[PDB]
Design an enzyme around this catalytic site. Structure first.
Site, PDB file in Angstrom:
ATOM      1  N   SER A  97       0.855  -1.193   0.000  1.00  0.00           N
ATOM      2  CA  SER A  97       0.000   0.000   0.000  1.00  0.00           C
ATOM      3  C   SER A  97       0.888   1.240   0.000  1.00  0.00           C
ATOM      4  O   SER A  97       1.679   1.408  -0.946  1.00  0.00           O
ATOM      5  CB  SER A  97      -0.990  -0.098   1.159  1.00  0.00           C
ATOM      6  OG  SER A  97      -2.012   0.866   0.981  1.00  0.00           O
ATOM      7  N   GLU A 116      -9.349  -4.777  -3.349  1.00  0.00           N
ATOM      8  CA  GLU A 116      -8.637  -3.684  -2.689  1.00  0.00           C
ATOM      9  C   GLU A 116      -9.588  -2.686  -2.041  1.00  0.00           C
ATOM     10  O   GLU A 116      -9.247  -2.076  -1.025  1.00  0.00           O
ATOM     11  CB  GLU A 116      -7.741  -2.954  -3.694  1.00  0.00           C
ATOM     12  CG  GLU A 116      -6.739  -3.835  -4.429  1.00  0.00           C
ATOM     13  CD  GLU A 116      -5.548  -4.256  -3.554  1.00  0.00           C
ATOM     14  OE1 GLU A 116      -5.583  -4.039  -2.316  1.00  0.00           O
ATOM     15  OE2 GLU A 116      -4.566  -4.797  -4.118  1.00  0.00           O
ATOM     16  N   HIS A 175      -7.601  -5.516   0.959  1.00  0.00           N
ATOM     17  CA  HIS A 175      -6.376  -4.725   1.019  1.00  0.00           C
ATOM     18  C   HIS A 175      -5.556  -5.093   2.249  1.00  0.00           C
ATOM     19  O   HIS A 175      -6.012  -4.927   3.386  1.00  0.00           O
ATOM     20  CB  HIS A 175      -6.764  -3.239   1.058  1.00  0.00           C
ATOM     21  CG  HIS A 175      -5.652  -2.284   0.745  1.00  0.00           C
ATOM     22  ND1 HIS A 175      -5.005  -2.259  -0.474  1.00  0.00           N
ATOM     23  CD2 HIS A 175      -5.108  -1.281   1.478  1.00  0.00           C
ATOM     24  CE1 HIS A 175      -4.101  -1.293  -0.473  1.00  0.00           C
ATOM     25  NE2 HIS A 175      -4.150  -0.682   0.699  1.00  0.00           N
TER      26      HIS A 175
HETATM   27  O1  LIG Z   1     -12.488  11.885   7.620  1.00  0.00           O
HETATM   28  C1  LIG Z   1     -11.892  10.859   7.950  1.00  0.00           C
HETATM   29  N1  LIG Z   1     -11.195  10.140   7.078  1.00  0.00           N
HETATM   30  C2  LIG Z   1     -10.614   9.036   7.548  1.00  0.00           C
HETATM   31  C3  LIG Z   1     -10.255   8.055   6.639  1.00  0.00           C
HETATM   32  C4  LIG Z   1      -9.644   6.889   7.073  1.00  0.00           C
HETATM   33  C5  LIG Z   1      -9.292   5.926   6.149  1.00  0.00           C
HETATM   34  O2  LIG Z   1     -10.211   4.849   6.272  1.00  0.00           O
HETATM   35  C6  LIG Z   1      -9.628   3.759   5.567  1.00  0.00           C
HETATM   36  C7  LIG Z   1      -8.332   3.328   6.261  1.00  0.00           C
HETATM   37  C8  LIG Z   1      -8.240   2.869   7.499  1.00  0.00           C
HETATM   38  N2  LIG Z   1      -6.942   2.615   7.650  1.00  0.00           N
HETATM   39  C9  LIG Z   1      -6.340   2.075   8.880  1.00  0.00           C
HETATM   40  C10 LIG Z   1      -6.740   0.614   8.976  1.00  0.00           C
HETATM   41  N3  LIG Z   1      -5.643  -0.311   8.604  1.00  0.00           N
HETATM   42  C11 LIG Z   1      -5.684  -1.229   7.615  1.00  0.00           C
HETATM   43  C12 LIG Z   1      -6.768  -2.114   7.453  1.00  0.00           C
HETATM   44  C13 LIG Z   1      -7.901  -2.153   8.275  1.00  0.00           C
HETATM   45  C14 LIG Z   1      -8.949  -3.044   8.052  1.00  0.00           C
HETATM   46  C15 LIG Z   1      -8.854  -3.937   6.987  1.00  0.00           C
HETATM   47  C16 LIG Z   1      -7.728  -3.918   6.171  1.00  0.00           C
HETATM   48  C17 LIG Z   1      -6.691  -3.016   6.388  1.00  0.00           C
HETATM   49  N4  LIG Z   1      -5.618  -3.030   5.568  1.00  0.00           N
HETATM   50  C18 LIG Z   1      -4.577  -2.185   5.728  1.00  0.00           C
HETATM   51  C19 LIG Z   1      -3.644  -2.222   5.016  1.00  0.00           C
HETATM   52  C20 LIG Z   1      -2.829  -1.390   5.224  1.00  0.00           C
HETATM   53  C21 LIG Z   1      -2.706  -1.060   6.366  1.00  0.00           C
HETATM   54  C22 LIG Z   1      -3.675  -0.600   6.845  1.00  0.00           C
HETATM   55  C23 LIG Z   1      -4.581  -1.294   6.749  1.00  0.00           C
HETATM   56  N5  LIG Z   1      -6.317   2.897   6.580  1.00  0.00           N
HETATM   57  N6  LIG Z   1      -7.119   3.339   5.715  1.00  0.00           N
HETATM   58  C24 LIG Z   1      -9.401   6.686   8.422  1.00  0.00           C
HETATM   59  C25 LIG Z   1      -9.765   7.675   9.322  1.00  0.00           C
HETATM   60  N7  LIG Z   1     -10.382   8.848   8.859  1.00  0.00           N
HETATM   61  N8  LIG Z   1     -11.875  10.389   9.198  1.00  0.00           N
HETATM   62  C26 LIG Z   1     -12.632  10.932  10.137  1.00  0.00           C
HETATM   63  C27 LIG Z   1     -12.620  12.252  10.579  1.00  0.00           C
HETATM   64  C28 LIG Z   1     -13.537  12.574  11.575  1.00  0.00           C
HETATM   65  C29 LIG Z   1     -14.391  11.578  12.060  1.00  0.00           C
HETATM   66  C30 LIG Z   1     -14.329  10.328  11.580  1.00  0.00           C
HETATM   67  C31 LIG Z   1     -13.458  10.022  10.631  1.00  0.00           C
HETATM   68  C32 LIG Z   1     -13.584   8.669  10.285  1.00  0.00           C
HETATM   69  C33 LIG Z   1     -12.518   7.810  10.908  1.00  0.00           C
HETATM   70  C34 LIG Z   1     -12.712   6.353  10.415  1.00  0.00           C
HETATM   71  C35 LIG Z   1     -14.140   6.103   9.938  1.00  0.00           C
HETATM   72  C36 LIG Z   1     -15.072   6.787  10.906  1.00  0.00           C
HETATM   73  N9  LIG Z   1     -14.683   8.215  11.017  1.00  0.00           N
HETATM   74  C37 LIG Z   1     -15.013   9.207  11.823  1.00  0.00           C
HETATM   75  O3  LIG Z   1     -15.960   9.122  12.585  1.00  0.00           O
END
Ligand SMILES: O=C(Nc1cc(COCc2cn(CCNC3=c4ccccc4=NC4CCCCC34)nn2)ccn1)Nc1cccc2c1[C@H]1CCCCN1C2=O
Ligand SMILES: O=C(Nc1cc(COCc2cn(CCNC3=c4ccccc4=NC4CCCCC34)nn2)ccn1)Nc1cccc2c1[C@H]1CCCCN1C2=O
Ligand SMILES: CC(=O)N[C@@H]1[C@@H](O)[C@H](O)[C@@H](CO)O[C@H]1O
Ligand SMILES: *[C@@H]1O[C@H](CO)[C@@H](O)[C@H](O)[C@H]1NC(C)=O
Ligand SMILES: *[C@@H]1O[C@H](CO)[C@@H](O)[C@H](O)[C@H]1NC(C)=O
Ligand SMILES: *[C@@H]1O[C@H](CO)[C@@H](O)[C@H](O)[C@H]1NC(C)=O
Ligand SMILES: *[C@@H]1O[C@H](CO)[C@@H](O)[C@H](O)[C@H]1NC(C)=O
Ligand SMILES: [Cl-]
Ligand SMILES: [Cl-]
Ligand SMILES: [Cl-]
Ligand SMILES: [Cl-]
Ligand SMILES: [Cl-]
Lengths: 532, 532
Positions: free
Chosen positions: A197, A324, A437
């Site tokens: 990634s 993905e 992913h």
């Molecule tokens: O505005 C935003 N954006 C935002 C966008 C994200 C990106 O979400 C996708 C993501 C998550 N991760 C780490 C997980 N680790 C992995 C996996 C995990 C599970 C399965 C496979 C995996 N495979 C992996 C491979 C690589 C390694 C990492 C991996 N990476 N990408 C995250 C946070 N905030 N957040 C925000 C702002 C205000 C309030 C809230 C929120 C959001 C926060 C979250 C939702 C509810 N929210 C709120 O209530």
């Protein structure tokens, strides 16, 4: 004695770890940079000052400061990616696993974790290097690097917060490996960098950047590539986001010196709490602080570098997973939890398309919609779910990688492409999410070899196949053992564009990985958005 | 006596003609307008001045002046569409077939021939009305109208060459039928107009045009619709083309009167010789002199009329053939002669796309190419041929008709949609051409009932089925006979969008005729061209 090593930075003492009824050596938490703290936050890393005495390297180091995922508290499927050590800005450390007895000068593989450049740790259970080091007799290194604003706040022109310092953290760990790995039995001339990634994007970025090219021999890229739409921003956009971050903390915005000084006095969690606010749109698969195309780490735009062959010419092995996009939609698209199988209405499909292609104008949204809608059956909740699944995965991972692989193969010295489409028998995520992913990583790191982890016999054999492909490629530039009777993974060529599946079935060779949709993403849609 | 009829324009004497194993009355070459010759060239038609004595209506009239197809001299497949009578500007006549004994007040069907508005004749063997009139007991009329520059030269604002006069010819024949068909045993309150290709567009145009709506009861449109991209032009484009016609003939262009006067002095064949030179693009399926959106025959744009329900509300029956595009590619894309089965290289595919969508910019051409290319297999000559085949038929015929169907059904009083996909067992055209534009006509007119034409007995049954659907629809507004045990042809509705196949196999109902490609042609590509 085996555990005591004199490096160009000082003596280190490792520890003996069990692995699969035998043992190997581990050197954990070796520092490679000065702690990027205080007035050095956002600054380029400085080499670690040599120390007297014996560095105790028997314990994992701290993880870098980062947004912690609390979407599903206690759920192993998400918690396995969170920091399992204390977080700290004092986090620039590397880990080494060494076969026992120590080899003379064996192949080295260096892991770069992913996590969207806002998260990640070298210490996750799934990155445990002992199984790969023991089974394939390689020296396995995992580095660390600053993420989020700490790694990628970019105020171009400023030498206090230039941007890309997390990429320089990686390069500094690579420089340390270059200078010292021979003392752990590793060949500094046969170092393979690999990552998933954002780690995979990182690997591609070191292929491109002149300052990194001589610090490694060849490269493996998993579910990521340097040209991914989420993996870099312009210097103007980086400047806009950095200022917006100051605005969110009521900082003096009048000068870079003032803004930077204000930001250096906030506690780390204070920056993390506002990190998501600087994004230009509501979106999924978009991250706030990422590499900047700065004219220094990257001399020109990534496309012009790829077009002109301005990159390291070597062998690469790379590929993608079948699904993905699934966990990005579960996390970010509210329609995906209205239904136990995440079937979604047509309205939720259209909303998700907007969230997934946030830069597109209204005509680009229609183009995406038309390309992924079955207009005979547009109210089908399953087809709607799967269509948006493919949109997210194609746009953010598969088609950027296919663009990179076709540009690279015109100048490079050997390309091997894979498609990982095995769903683990013990997966804790729902079945609709498919091959998620990140879930090829546990196969690459040999976890199915651990009986108590409850993989099938077939999955242990798949893990062993993948580790040997990876290590044999690291050692020779070719994943195959010629003279063996096994089926051969063929080269990806400009003309035949071959790739293999990675799963538990006998090997299949295909051609033109998702060519139909990637022509849409890589050629037609950018022309449409360039027109309007 | 049965052959002697007193009309509001004078007495006419017809002839007894054999049909199958019986006989029927025919009144051939009845004039409905003053000959549009001399100073009346390009002018609106004038009613035929009543005559004294007995008009001998026993032989076919002349055909209108038109481009004659010599692509395949002597080949029945193309010669069956050329004039079989002498050409003359003195050509505004109609033909009537009347069952024997004369009915008292039976259903009337009026045929309007196609031919791109630049050719066509009422006297073709395939338009012989005696089988339909005999078998279904209808009074069958075929009209004529001026084609090419003679019928559609449009210098808007001029009363000497106003445009649309070929459509006004059609209307004046419809008015003649309205006033006189009762004297032949036809009910003027139950008149169905039907036509194929340009005749089907024409039928659609009388549905729209207020000055025509009261001259017929219901309508049948075969492989054509009023909004087809080849079937109309703006007044500015009509004027440009008329001026360019003068330029080609070294006419004085200082004013409409001088241009028209020059044009009126030329022999008909001199106009025909330069007719193709005024087209704005290299193109296929595009014709020089066609109806103009003038604000009189058509009060506003076709789309606004369709959107507001500004059209006659009644029942329609309509449909398309499987391979509308094929003969246009044979004639106009030289790639379709390099190979016996017309396998097409990728270069010739791309050239054909340009010829087929001549108004599109480069972004639109790429959109079309992407939608019809199999990028796993882009050098397949068969797929390239079939793809370009579908482009031509979808863009010019199928998707315009589907757009018309959906707009009309919102306000109309009953829609029946068909898809004709039978390939005649005796076809003289190569197999790759499939079910060609125009080749349902011979079934509609009952030629399979003639044993000497070597149709199969199953094709006779299909011809009898279609004639009965058409006549029963004309009589009742519903092609289905009530109290019958056959399967019912369902109404097309906004919600379910049902249609049937017409072929020798049992009736199948489907839904959403080529919806995937017609969303492209009718919604996305227009939005793309408008925006860019
Ligand atoms: O505005 C935003 N954006 C935002 C966008 C994200 C990106 O979400 C996708 C993501 C998550 N991760 C780490 C997980 N680790 C992995 C996996 C995990 C599970 C399965 C496979 C995996 N495979 C992996 C491979 C690589 C390694 C990492 C991996 N990476 N990408 C995250 C946070 N905030 N957040 C925000 C702002 C205000 C309030 C809230 C929120 C959001 C926060 C979250 C939702 C509810 N929210 C709120 O209530
Ligand atoms: O020159 C043109 N066009 C053009 C088109 C034609 C006639 O071709 C279509 C056609 C013919 N017919 C009468 C046959 N009758 C019928 C059938 C006959 C056979 C099978 C089924 C039939 N079914 C029928 C149903 C309805 C009735 C009629 C039927 N009707 N339509 C002639 C001359 N010029 N475009 C253009 C403009 C500028 C540059 C270029 C070009 C192109 C074209 C030149 C090469 C590349 N080009 C350029 O460089
Ligand atoms: C129009 C046509 O082709 N008619 C043919 C006829 O010429 C031939 O003698 C007969 C014998 O098979 O079959 C039919
Ligand atoms: C190094 O650290 C480990 C874990 O805290 C400890 O068990 C070991 O005794 C230490 N060795 C020293 C301090 O020499
Ligand atoms: C790799 O480079 C060597 C040395 O120039 C060359 O002989 C070989 O053909 C190359 N292989 C590929 C797959 O490009
Ligand atoms: C009608 O015209 C035909 C064709 O010229 C002719 O053979 C026929 O005898 C005419 N009938 C008359 C004049 O009664
Ligand atoms: C046709 O119009 C009549 C009269 O209003 C109406 O009762 C009937 O339902 C209509 N049928 C269709 C198919 O619109
Ligand atoms: Cl602090
Ligand atoms: Cl799935
Ligand atoms: Cl096991
Ligand atoms: Cl196997
Ligand atoms: Cl003349």
């Amino acid at each position: 004695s085996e555990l005591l090593v004199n490096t160009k930075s000082g003596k280190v003492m490792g520890t003996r770890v069990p692995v699969l009824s035998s043992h190997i050596s581990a050197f954990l938490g070796i520092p490679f940079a000065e702690p990027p703290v205080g007035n050095m936050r956002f600054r380029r890393p400085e080499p670690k000052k040599p120390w007297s005495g014996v560095w105790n390297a028997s314990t994992y180091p701290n993880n870098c400061q980062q947004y912690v995922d609390e979407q599903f508290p206690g759920f192993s499927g998400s918690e396995m990616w969170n920091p399992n050590r204390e977080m700290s800005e004092d986090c620039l450390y590397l880990n080494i696993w060494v076969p026992s007895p120590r080899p003379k000068s064996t192949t080295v593989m260096v892991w770069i974790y992913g996590g969207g450049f806002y998260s990640g740790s070298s210490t996750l259970d799934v990155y445990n290097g002992k199984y790969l080091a023991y089974t394939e007799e390689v020296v396995l290194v995992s580095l660390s690097y600053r993420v989020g604003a700490f790694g990628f706040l970019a105020l171009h022109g400023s030498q206090e917060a230039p941007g890309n310092v997390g990429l320089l953290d990686q390069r500094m760990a690579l420089q340390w490996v270059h200078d010292n790995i021979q003392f752990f039995g590793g060949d500094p001339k046969t170092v393979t960098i690999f990552g998933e990634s954002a780690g995979g994007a990182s690997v591609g970025m070191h292929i491109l950047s002149p300052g990194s090219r001589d610090l490694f021999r060849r490269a493996i890229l998993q579910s990521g590539s340097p040209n991914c739409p989420w993996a870099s921003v312009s210097v103007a956009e980086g400047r806009r986001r950095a200022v917006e971050l100051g605005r969110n903390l009521n900082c003096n915005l009048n000068s870079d010196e003032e803004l930077i000084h204000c930001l250096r006095e906030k506690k780390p969690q204070e920056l993390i709490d506002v990190e998501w606010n600087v994004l230009p749109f509501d979106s999924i698969f978009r991250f706030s602080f990422v590499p900047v195309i700065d004219g220094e780490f990257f001399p020109t735009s990534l496309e012009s570098m790829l077009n002109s062959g301005n990159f390291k010419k070597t062998q690469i092995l790379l590929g993608v997973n079948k699904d993905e996009g699934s966990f990005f939609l579960l996390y970010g698209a509210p329609g995906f939890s209205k239904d136990s199988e995440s079937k979604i209405s047509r309205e939720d499909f259209m909303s998700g398309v907007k969230l997934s292609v946030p830069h597109a104008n209204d005509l680009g949204l229609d183009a995406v919609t038309l390309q992924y809608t079955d207009w005979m059956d547009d109210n089908n909740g399953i087809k709607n779910r799967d269509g948006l699944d493919d949109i997210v995965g194609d746009h953010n991972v598969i088609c950027p990688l296919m663009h990179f692989v076709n540009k690279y193969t015109k100048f490079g010295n050997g390309t091997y492409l894979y498609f990982f489409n095995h769903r683990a028998s013990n997966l804790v995520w729902p079945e609709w999410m498919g091959v998620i992913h990140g879930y090829e990583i546990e196969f690459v790191f040999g976890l199915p070899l651990v009986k108590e982890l409850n993989y099938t016999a077939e999955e242990e054999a798949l893990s062993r196949r993948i580790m040997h492909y990876w290590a044999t490629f690291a050692k020779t530039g070719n994943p195959n053992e010629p003279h063996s009777q096994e089926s051969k993974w063929p080269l990806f060529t400009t003309k035949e564009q071959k790739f293999i599946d990675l799963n538990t079935e006998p090997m299949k060779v295909h051609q033109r990985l998702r060519v139909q949709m990637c022509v849409f993403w890589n050629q037609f849609l950018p022309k449409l958005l360039n027109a309007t």
